[PDB]
Enzyme design. Structure first.
Site, short mmCIF file in Angstrom:
data_model
loop_
_atom_site.label_atom_id
_atom_site.label_comp_id
_atom_site.label_asym_id
_atom_site.label_seq_id
_atom_site.Cartn_x
_atom_site.Cartn_y
_atom_site.Cartn_z
N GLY A 108 -50.69 -120.70 65.67
CA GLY A 108 -50.25 -119.50 65.01
C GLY A 108 -48.95 -118.99 65.60
O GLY A 108 -48.08 -118.51 64.88
N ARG A 109 -48.79 -119.11 66.92
CA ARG A 109 -47.58 -118.61 67.53
C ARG A 109 -46.32 -119.38 67.19
O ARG A 109 -45.29 -118.78 66.88
CB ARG A 109 -47.76 -118.53 69.04
CG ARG A 109 -48.75 -117.45 69.46
CD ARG A 109 -49.16 -117.57 70.92
NE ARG A 109 -50.08 -116.50 71.28
CZ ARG A 109 -50.82 -116.47 72.39
NH1 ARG A 109 -50.75 -117.48 73.25
NH2 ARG A 109 -51.62 -115.45 72.63
N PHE B 194 -48.81 -109.50 65.53
CA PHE B 194 -49.53 -110.73 65.17
C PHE B 194 -49.53 -111.77 66.29
O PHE B 194 -48.61 -111.82 67.11
CB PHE B 194 -48.87 -111.41 63.96
CG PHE B 194 -49.29 -110.86 62.62
CD1 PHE B 194 -50.45 -110.12 62.49
CD2 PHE B 194 -48.55 -111.15 61.47
CE1 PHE B 194 -50.87 -109.67 61.25
CE2 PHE B 194 -48.97 -110.70 60.21
CZ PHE B 194 -50.13 -109.97 60.10
N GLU B 195 -50.55 -112.63 66.29
CA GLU B 195 -50.67 -113.71 67.27
C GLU B 195 -50.58 -113.17 68.69
O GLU B 195 -50.00 -113.82 69.57
CB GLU B 195 -49.54 -114.73 67.08
CG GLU B 195 -49.29 -115.14 65.63
CD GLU B 195 -50.47 -115.87 65.01
OE1 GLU B 195 -50.61 -115.80 63.77
OE2 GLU B 195 -51.25 -116.50 65.75
N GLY B 196 -51.16 -112.00 68.91
CA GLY B 196 -51.08 -111.38 70.22
C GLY B 196 -49.81 -110.55 70.21
O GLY B 196 -48.77 -111.01 69.72
#
Ligand SMILES: Cc1cc2nc3c(=O)[nH]c(=O)nc-3n(C[C@H](O)[C@H](O)[C@H](O)COP(=O)(O)OP(=O)(O)OC[C@H]3O[C@@H](n4cnc5c(N)ncnc54)[C@H](O)[C@@H]3O)c2cc1C
Ligand SMILES: Cc1cc2nc3c(=O)[nH]c(=O)nc-3n(C[C@H](O)[C@H](O)[C@H](O)COP(=O)(O)OP(=O)(O)OC[C@H]3O[C@@H](n4cnc5c(N)ncnc54)[C@H](O)[C@@H]3O)c2cc1C
Lengths: 546, 549
Positions: free
Chosen positions: B259-260, B393-395
Site C-alpha cells: 500500500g505504501r 493513509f497507509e499509516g
C-alpha cells in the site's frame, strides 16, 4: 516623526516601544468579549444551516452585529458611526474570524463595502448611505474583480457611458466573485467611463438591469455569499459617482491597507481557534495507551503552532498600534488614509505572515485529528478549507511579497542582536540586487521574494522578542522558537538568491558576509517546543492568557 | 546478496544501478497506456456524477477495469490472475491518480482487499474468492480500523467467539471508515478470539448481522465509498478464518508495504496532473498584459514543482525496481512477502515523500489559479481536497517517520561533489542516530522529534541520490531538477540536524558535533533562481511534467 516610529523605520532603529495585546485598555477588552459572546450564541448556532445553503441568515446576523455597534467602528460619528481606534476594529476582526464564513460577510461589509464611501464619499452620499451601513439595515458589497481581471484590478472591462440626457451613467459588464452579492443592498462597482476612466459607482440593488449569477460553489467559507454581478444597461445617477472619474484606483488602493491588517488579525483568530481544537483533541484522543498529545511528534506540532501564532499576533498588534498612534488627533479622510498608508509595508507583512501561519495551523490541526480531520463532522475539516482563500485575499501573497520590498528599493541581548542582523541581511541583498539590475529590479521577483521573507521574519521576530521581554513567562520560549527558524530561513533564502546577484571573487566575501549575518548558536527546539506543548494542553489552546 | 542491494544497503554503499522510468519495458508502457485510456474514456466522464452521490457507478467501473486485467495484475495465475512484476501494478496506481476517488476504490480492492487472501488465503478459499476479485465480479473491502483504534490497529476490540456447535464464529464490534463498504461483496475483518487473539476473518456481504452506516461525508475523494461497518452477532464459518488465530498482525503488516509504495506512485501521478493543470493555466491566464507563467514567482513554483515530482518519481520506481529483482525466481506468498518486506523502509520513505510532494504541488497549483483555484468548477480545487488524505493513509507520516530510523537504530575531496554531498547526508543521519542511541539507548523510541529529523535526512538522501543517479543516465533537464532538489535537501539537513542535536549533546562536546553536522552539509551556493526558471520554461513548453513519457 522619529526615524524608528515612521513607516518601515524599524529597519534602521529599534522601536523604543511596541503596542501589545497586554496594552488593550478596558474598552478594547469590553468589545472583544462582546464579539466573543456574539459569535458564541448567534453565529456558531446557525453556522451549520448557513454552510448548507441558508445564506439569507447572514442578514439577521449582520443586523445584530449592527445593533452591537460592530458595524459602526470605522464610521465617522456624524454618520451613525463610533469612529474608534483601529485596535478595536482589529480585535473584532480577530474574534469574528474563527466561527465561520460570517467573518467574510462582516469583513466585506465593514472594509471594502463601507470604507470607499467614508474616504471618497461626498457629504450627501455619506448622509444617505453610511447611517444604514453602520446600523446594519443595509449590507454592502465591493465590485472590482472581473473574469479577466483580478490581481490586475485596474484592468476592469465594465464600461460606463453617459446617457443621452446626461442624467445617468449606463454600465455594462460582469463582476466576478462578489462577496455578499446574495443580499447586499448597496454595491460599489468599478467601471471605465468610455472604456478609459477607472471610476467607482454607488449602485443600489433594486436597479433595473442588475442581476446576479447563482451562488458560487467554493472550497470553503460556504457560510459566505459569493456571486457574479451582471450589469446590463444599469442606469446610475451621475451623482452616485464615487470619488473622481478616472481616479478610482485611489479608492481601491486605500481600502487594501485596512483589508490587510484586518485579515492578518482574522488569521490570528482562526489560528487560535484551530489550536483550540487541536489541543483539546490531542488531550481527548488516546492511542497506544496514551493521550496522543503526550507523543513527541504531536508536541512538536502544538509547540510550533503556539510559537507562530504568538509571532503573528505580536506583529499584527504592533502594526495596528503604530497606526493608531499616527491617527491620534487626526481628522479627515485624507489624514486617515495617509496615516494608514504610512504603514502599508507593515500591513502587507502581517497579512502574508498571518495567512501563512494559519495555513500551517489548520494543516497540522487536521494531521492531529488523523482520519477524523478529514470528516465534515469535525470543525477542523471546515477550518482547513476555509483557510485556503486567505493567501489570495487582499492581494495574493505573491503580489504582497513584491510590495514589501518596494519601500526599500528607491521607494547585550544575543537574540535582539540576531534580529538586527536579519535587518542587515535584507538591506544587503536588497542593495546588491539594485546595484545590478537598477531600474528593472522589479523583474527579479524571486529576488524580491527572498528579501520580503527575511523582512517578514525580521519584523515578526522583533515583535515577538520585544513583547517577550515585557510579558515574560512562556513568551520568551515562543519567541526563541520562532527566531531560531527565522535564522535558518534567512541563511537559506539569501544563499538561494545571492548567486543571482554576484559572482567571481567579489561574491566570495558576499557569501561569507551572509554566513556571518546569520550566525548563531543552535537552540534546543525539542525541549522548547515540548515546553510550549505542555502549556498548550494545559490551557486547551493558545497558552498566552488574555 | 550484495551489500547495497539489501534493504538499506544504499546507506553504506553506492548502488551499482537504479531502475528508472525510462527503463520501462514495452509491457509496462502498454498497461500504462491502457490505464490512461480507461481513465479518460470511462472513469473521468462519470467523476462528476460519482462526486455527487452516484457512488454505485464504482461497480460497473470496477467491472470494466477487471475485464481489462487491471484487477488481476497482483493476483496469482492459478486463480485468474496475471501475476505480473510489482512495477506494473505500481505504474497502474500512478496513472489512476486521474480518476479521483475511484483511485481509492481501485486501491483498496487490489491491495488491502485482495492481498490478504493472496498472502494467507487457504488453498480452497483462494479458488472460491480470488477469481471473482481478480475479474471484478466481486469487490473487496478491508476492515481493520475502529472508532477507538486507528494507528494502533492491533487495539481493535471487535470480538470473536466460537459457537457451541464449533462450526461458526460469532463476531461483534464496529469497524470505522471502510472503503468500498457501500458495494463490497467480500470483507476481511479483524477481531480477537475471546478478546486476545488478533485474527482476520472472511465475511460475505450477505451475512446476517452485518450492517453499514451511511456514506461518510469527507472533505475529498467523494467518488469513493466509505462507511462504518457494524457487526451484531455475525456467524462466520470456522474455515473462513484467514491465516492463523492470533497472528492476524502478520496480514496487516505485510499489506502495508505494498500500500505504501503504490500510494507513493499514486501521489507522483496526482502531482503530475496538478502540474499539467498549473502549467496550462499559467500559459493561458494573462494578467498585466502577459501570461502569468512569465512572472518570476510563478516560474519559481513551476520549477520547484517539477523538481520535487522528479525526485519522488525517481525514488518510487527505484524502490519498486529493487523489490522486483529480489522477487525474480521466487513464487509463493512467503517468498514474495519476504521479498517485499526486504524494502519496508524504502516503501515508507516514498510513502512520506510522495504524499508531501503532492501536497506541495496541489497547493501551489491552487495558488497559480488564484481565486479560481478555490472554485469547484476547476479540477485543481478537487485535487487540493483529494490530496489531503494521503498523509494519513497507509499509516500517518508521523508513524512512518518513526519507522524509517528503525534499521539505523537496530545497531549502536571533490569529483562528482554532488554525489559526495549525498554520501555526507547518509553520514549525517548516522551521526545523529548514533548519538541518540548512545544517550537514550533502548528508550530512544520516546525521542520522536529526534527520530523524525533523522527520518527526514534519510528521505532526502534516498530521494536526492535516486534523483541524481537517474539524471546521469537520463541527462538533459534531469540534472537541473536533481540539483534544485539536492541544494534544498542539504539546507533542510543542516537545520534539522541542528534542531535536534542540542537534545543529544551539550557543553564543549556539543560544539564539536555542531561543526561536524555543518561540514557534512557544507555546499557551494547554487543559483536556484536560474535553475528553477530553466525548469519552468521546460514546464510551460511541455505543458506539464517536462520529462518525456
Ligand atoms: C477516506 C478514508 C478511507 C479509509 N479506508 C479504510 C479501509 O479501507 N480500511 C481500514 O481499515 N481503514 C480505513 N480508513 C481508516 C484509517 O485506516 C484510519 O483513519 C487510520 O488508521 C486512523 O488513524 P487515526 O485516525 O485513528 O489516528 P488519530 O487520528 O487516532 O491519530 C492522531 C495521531 O496519530 C498520532 N500518533 C499515533 N501514534 C503515534 C505514535 N506512536 N507516535 C507519535 N504520534 C502518533 C499522530 O502523531 C497524531 O497525534 C480510511 C479512512 C479514511 C479517512
Ligand atoms: C471567496 C471569494 C470572495 C471574493 N470576494 C470579493 C469581493 O467581495 N470583491 C471583489 O472585488 N473581489 C472578490 N473576490 C475576488 C478576488 O478579488 C479575486 O479572486 C482576485 O483579485 C483574483 O486574482 P485572480 O484570481 O484574477 O488572479 P489569477 O487567479 O488571475 O492570478 C494568478 C496569479 O497571480 C499571479 N500574479 C499576478 N500578478 C503578478 C505579479 N505582478 N507578479 C507575480 N505574480 C503575479 C500569481 O503569481 C499567479 O500566477 C473574491 C474571491 C473569492 C474566491
Amino acid at each position: 516623526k522619529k526615524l524608528w516610529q515612521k513607516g518601515g523605520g524599524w529597519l534602521l532603529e529599534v522601536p523604543e516601544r511596541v503596542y501589545t495585546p497586554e496594552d488593550f485598555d478596558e474598552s478594547v477588552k469590553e468589545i472583544a468579549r462582546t464579539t466573543r459572546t456574539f459569535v458564541e450564541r448567534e453565529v456558531l448556532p446557525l453556522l451549520e444551516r448557513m454552510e448548507h445553503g441558508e445564506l439569507e441568515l447572514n442578514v439577521p446576523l449582520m443586523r445584530k452585529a449592527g445593533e452591537l455597534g460592530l458595524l459602526a467602528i470605522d464610521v465617522p460619528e456624524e454618520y451613525g458611526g463610533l469612529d474608534l481606534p483601529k485596535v478595536i476594529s482589529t480585535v473584532v476582526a480577530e474574534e469574528l474570524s474563527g466561527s465561520g464564513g460570517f467573518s467574510v460577510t462582516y469583513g466585506a461589509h465593514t472594509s471594502i463595502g463601507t470604507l470607499p464611501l467614508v474616504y471618497f464619499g461626498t457629504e450627501e452620499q455619506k448622509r444617505k448611505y453610511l447611517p444604514k451601513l453602520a446600523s446594519g439595515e443595509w449590507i454592502a458589497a465591493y465590485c472590482l474583480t472581473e473574469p479577466g481581471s483580478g490581481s490586475d484590478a485596474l484592468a476592469a472591462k465594465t464600461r460606463a457611458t453617459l446617457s443621452e440626457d446626461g442624467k445617468h451613467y449606463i454600465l455594462n459588464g460582469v463582476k466576478q466573485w462578489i462577496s455578499n452579492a446574495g443580499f447586499a443592498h448597496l454595491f460599489t462597482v468599478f467601471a471605465k467611463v468610455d472604456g478609459e476612466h477607472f471610476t467607482a459607482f454607488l449602485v443600489e440593488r433594486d436597479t433595473p438591469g442588475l442581476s446576479f449569477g447563482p451562488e458560487e460553489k467554493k472550497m470553503g467559507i460556504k457560510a459566505s455569499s459569493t456571486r457574479q454581478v451582471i450589469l446590463e444597461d444599469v442606469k446610475v445617477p451621475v451623482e452616485n459617482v464615487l470619488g473622481e472619474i478616472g481616479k478610482g484606483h485611489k479608492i481601491a488602493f486605500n481600502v487594501l491597507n485596512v483589508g490587510r491588517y484586518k485579515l492578518g488579525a482574522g488569521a490570528v483568530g482562526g489560528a487560535k481557534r484551530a489550536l483550540e481544537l487541536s489541543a483539546q483533541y490531542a488531550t481527548q484522543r488516546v492511542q497506544f495507551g496514551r493521550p496522543i498529545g503526550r507523543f513527541g511528534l504531536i508536541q512538536q506540532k502544538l509547540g510550533e503552532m503556539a510559537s507562530r501564532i504568538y509571532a503573528a499576533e505580536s506583529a499584527v498588534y504592533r502594526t495596528v498600534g503604530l497606526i493608531d498612534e499616527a491617527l491620534l488627533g487626526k481628522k479627515g479622510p485624507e489624514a486617515v488614509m495617509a496615516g494608514i498608508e504610512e504603514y502599508a509595508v507593515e500591513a502587507s507583512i502581517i497579512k502574508v505572515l498571518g495567512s501563512e501561519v494559519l495555513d500551517y495551523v489548520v494543516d497540522e490541526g487536521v494531521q492531529i485529528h488523523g482520519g477524523y480531520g478529514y470528516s465534515q463532522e469535525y470543525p477542523i475539516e471546515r477550518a482547513y478549507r476555509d483557510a485556503r482563500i486567505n493567501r489570495i485575499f487582499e492581494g495574493t501573497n505573491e503580489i504582497n511579497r513584491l510590495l514589501i520590498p518596494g519601500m526599500l528599493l528607491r521607494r547585550e541581548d544575543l537574540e535582539l542582536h540576531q534580529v538586527q542582523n536579519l535587518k542587515k541581511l535584507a538591506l544587503m541583498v536588497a542593495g546588491l540586487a539594485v546595484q545590478k539590475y537598477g531600474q528593472g529590479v522589479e523583474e527579479e521577483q524571486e529576488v524580491l521574494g527572498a528579501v520580503a521573507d527575511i523582512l517578514i521574519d525580521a519584523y515578526a521576530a522583533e515583535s515577538a522578542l520585544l513583547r517577550a521581554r515585557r510579558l515574560g513567562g512562556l513568551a520568551p520560549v515562543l519567541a526563541r522558537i520562532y527566531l531560531a527558524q527565522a535564522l535558518d530561513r534567512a541563511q537559506a533564502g539569501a544563499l538561494s538568491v545571492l548567486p543571482r546577484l554576484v559572482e567571481g571573487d567579489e561574491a566570495r566575501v558576499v557569501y561569507s558576509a551572509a554566513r556571518r549575518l546569520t550566525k548563531r548558536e543552535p537552540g534546543d527546539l525539542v525541549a522548547l517546543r515540548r515546553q510550549a506543548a505542555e502549556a498548550v494542553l494545559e490551557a486547551g489552546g493558545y497558552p498566552i492568557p488574555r
